Design a protein around this ligand. Structure first.
Ligand code: HEM
Ligand SMILES: [Co+2]
Length: 153
């Protein structure tokens, strides 16, 4: 569970993300794919992109990233009260896309990495910890939803 202060730190840095959702989404996926190439295999249409510049030039990948970060942003703003916005997310990622919880940890690392790289003055130790707790909570609750749907994350 997060304090109100921690949620404010999360939402404050998220406001910085919202200044360039597309750009953040691209950097997060670039970071993710380079750190964990196996995650690229879950994308039938992005497995062809070879370089960083090609990934940045992909409108498909850019739209995909906005979709994910938008959904995450909406979840974060619920400050933990996100069961309703988590069920559809869990359902598509467990039954359709088959995304292991381990992969959600990977993109979480990428998120924290990109947020630090872009906003060092707004993402200090306290802000990083709060975001980590927020993302942990997200993964925790979605893992439970996974199980309810009969998928071992
Ligand atoms: C931060 C957590 C994540 C959020 C919030 C998120 C959110 C979404 C949303 C909102 C969609 C569109 C609707 C849907 O299919 O559910 C989507 C599609 C997808 N996501 Fe995620 N996602 C997350 C992590 C991941 C991870 C880690 C992977 C795998 C590496 C992944 C792979 C996919 C794929 C493969 C699709 C559908 C691609 C398509 O539209 O053709 N997602 N995600
Ligand atoms: Co993605």
């Amino acid at each position: 569970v997060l304090s109100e202060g921690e949620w404010q730190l999360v939402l404050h840095v998220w406001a910085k993300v919202e200044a360039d959702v597309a750009g953040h989404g691209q950097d997060i996926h670039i970071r993710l794919f380079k750190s964990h190439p196996e995650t690229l295999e879950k994308h039938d249409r992005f497995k062809h992109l070879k370089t960083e510049a090609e990934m940045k030039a992909s409108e498909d990948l850019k739209k995909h990233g906005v979709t994910e970060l938008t959904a995450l942003g909406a979840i974060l703003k619920k400050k933990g009260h996100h069961e309703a916005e988590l069920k559809p997310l869990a359902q598509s990622h467990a039954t359709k896309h088959k995304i292991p919880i381990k992969y959600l940890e990977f993109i979480s690392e990428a998120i924290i990495h990109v947020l630090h790289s872009r906003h060092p003055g707004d993402f200090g130790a306290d802000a990083q910890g709060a975001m980590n707790k927020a993302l942990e909570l997200f993964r925790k609750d979605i893992a439970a939803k996974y199980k309810e749907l009969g998928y071992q994350g």
